[PDB]
């Protein structure tokens, strides 16, 4: 039921605007929760919602704690997460419920609470990088004995959605400009109002700035350093939108020194958070308590926004470091990787001058992972170019315990463009253009044929029928791609139409034996 309490637009509107002095917000949050519960769970009866909230209140009061994130995270942590032989794990019967909760709430605050209020045995050091998994020994033997195989991993973008929030905090202006770029489109404008009505792009910058400043303010509490005492002049949370407060007519930024070098990172967030909740183990002022509540609510609002935007500026901010992290993240904990056969779908770029950047970064990211695990004498300690990476990668022996890679560029597809008397030429020429850079780069270095193995076209099905890609796939086949894959039947006007769309892809495309379709829900 707490999915409404820790992820809801109405509560964020209620908490941010309401002043900080008042502590009698138990009535306002209840009305907000009922509004939030009704907006997202239409079929849930009200009498259950009234009973569930009333039962939740008595749980907090019986435990002699106060309503807020420090209490909700306490209840969620012990309900789902219990310590196991692998450290912190998840209840098997409650895993199905837990997966639903992850759709609306990030686990990062929860696990910090569980670590503080239920530490593991022997005090062995535990660092959070990977989401928690339920533990069942019969499956664990299968994974170790036979590693997993991922057939769909979008290399572009972030490793997951949780850590992209930290990148959004690291790049406030860049993400704001990115958001404004898409905000022009009618679909994106409706989508944002769908999840959060009355969301102007300035408010998104305001909320991002509020979350940034709250992080700086709360970091002071966790480290034990005395607050800079200008907070008394801050009577409203809205003063955090401008990233500068004026106390006694002087400039006072909220920024503060972080002990960790990378203040915007998974390690930094957990180390800060576990210290903060430790200091609030018995007492917590409702002012700061709500400051943490606002920050958690702000994070969940952005996460809800991000997960639906998939269905550049921020993408190319680093362009090299995330590729190593994702491969290491795909590798997982332990000495042996849990995933053996993995292919990374990435969107091709029309610029010929960008492929050598993207291919090298992925290949350099792959190599710098391999050199860390397999210790052997490479031709170059710093490749700096595609050819030198290929020299290093051709020396490795696949023993089956490390993440193997086979790049598959997945083409993009846009709305139909009117003109010149047949449906798709403006879009078709773009696909013809993008393929040429893919085609000629393959011929420039033929050794790339061992990594660029497949080609995908994954945007939708209404925009361009699959038979339009029949000439495009066949010419790529003559270039030596040696694999193909499609993505069909996501949304279809009628169930019979979806079946027809599969056959059009099936009967017309040059799909040899062993090809793979995509998301055939029809």
């Amino acid at each position: 039921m707490e999915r409404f309490l820790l992820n809801s637009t109405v509560l964020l509107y209620r908490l941010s605007t309401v002043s900080l002095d008042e502590v009698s917000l138990d009535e306002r949050v209840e009305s907000s929760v009922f509004l939030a519960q009704y907006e997202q769970a239409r079929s849930l009866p009200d009498h259950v919602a009234k009973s569930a909230w009333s039962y939740l209140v008595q749980q907090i009061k019986q435990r002699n704690m106060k309503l807020g994130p420090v209490a909700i995270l306490r209840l969620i942590a012990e309900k789902f997460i219990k310590n196991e032989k692998g450290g912190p794990k998840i209840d098997l019967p409650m895993f199905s419920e837990w997966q639903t909760l992850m759709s609306r709430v990030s686990c990062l605050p929860i696990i910090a609470c569980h670590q503080v209020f239920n530490p593991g045995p022997a005090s062995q050091e535990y660092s959070f990088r990977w989401p928690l998994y339920p533990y069942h020994p019969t499956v664990e033997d299968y994974i170790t004995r036979e590693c997993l195989h991922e057939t769909h991993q979008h290399l572009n973008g972030s490793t997951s959605a949780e850590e992209c929030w930290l990148d959004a905090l690291k790049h406030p202006e860049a993400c704001l400009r990115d958001f404004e770029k898409g905000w022009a489109s009618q679909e994106m404008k409706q989508l944002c109002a769908q999840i959060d009505p009355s969301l102007t792009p300035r408010i998104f910058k305001d909320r991002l700035q509020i979350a940034c400043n709250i992080r700086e303010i709360l970091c002071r509490v966790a480290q034990g350093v005395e607050l800079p005492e200008w907070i008394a002049s801050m009577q409203n949370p809205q003063q955090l939108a401008n990233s500068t407060i004026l106390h006694n007519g002087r400039e006072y930024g909220f920024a503060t020194v972080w002990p960790i070098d990378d203040k915007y990172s998974q390690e930094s967030e957990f180390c800060w958070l576990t210290g903060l909740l430790e200091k609030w183990r018995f007492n917590a002022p409702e002012g700061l308590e709500r400051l943490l509540w606002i920050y958690l609510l702000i994070q969940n609002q952005y996460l809800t926004l991000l997960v639906q935007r998939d269905d550049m500026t921020e993408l190319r901010e680093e362009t090299e470091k995330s590729y190593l992290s994702r491969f290491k993240h795909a590798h997982g904990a332990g000495v042996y990787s849990q995933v053996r056969y993995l292919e990374g779908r990435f969107a091709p770029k029309s610029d010929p001058n960008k492929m050598q950047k993207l291919l090298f970064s992925v290949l350099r990211g792959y190599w710098e992972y391999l050199s860390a695990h397999m210790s052997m004498e490479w031709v170059h300690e710093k490749p700096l170019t595609i050819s030198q990476v290929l020299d290093n990668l051709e020396l490795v022996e696949p023993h089956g315990k490390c993440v193997e890679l086979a790049l598959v560029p997945h083409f993009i597809k846009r709305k139909p463009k009117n003109g010149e008397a047949y449906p798709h030429a403006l879009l078709f020429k773009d696909l013809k253009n993008q393929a040429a850079i893919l085609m000629d780069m393959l011929k420039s270095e033929p050794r790339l044929t061992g990594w660029i193995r497949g080609v995908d076209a994954a945007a939708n099905e209404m925009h361009a029928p699959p038979e339009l890609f029949c000439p495009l796939f066949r010419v790529l086949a003559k270039s030596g791609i040696a694999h193909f894959t499609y993505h069909v039947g996501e949304d279809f006007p009628h169930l019979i139409s979806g079946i027809r769309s599969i056959d059009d892809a099936l009967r017309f495309l040059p799909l040899r034996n062993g090809d793979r379709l995509g998301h055939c829900t029809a």
């Binding site: 900080l20 002095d21 502590v23 009698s24 008394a232 007492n283 002022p285 409702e286």
Partner: protein
Amino acid sequence: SVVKSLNSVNIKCLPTIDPTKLPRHEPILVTVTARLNKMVSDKLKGYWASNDYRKQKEQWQNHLAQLQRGLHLLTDKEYK
């Protein structure tokens, strides 16, 4: 003059109140608490965002609530 000299031995003085400058049926004890509530709540705005801030407000909410019940004791036209 005397209230400003005390406002400018740390004694805090309530701002001037005129019983003639009040509703006819409104008791002065109501105004005194209401005026005093402004001074105390102002200090809690300053003494905000601390552990004792909750520990001081909880007493304050107790005092106003228990004093509120005495208004039914007095303002009632006939006790029930």
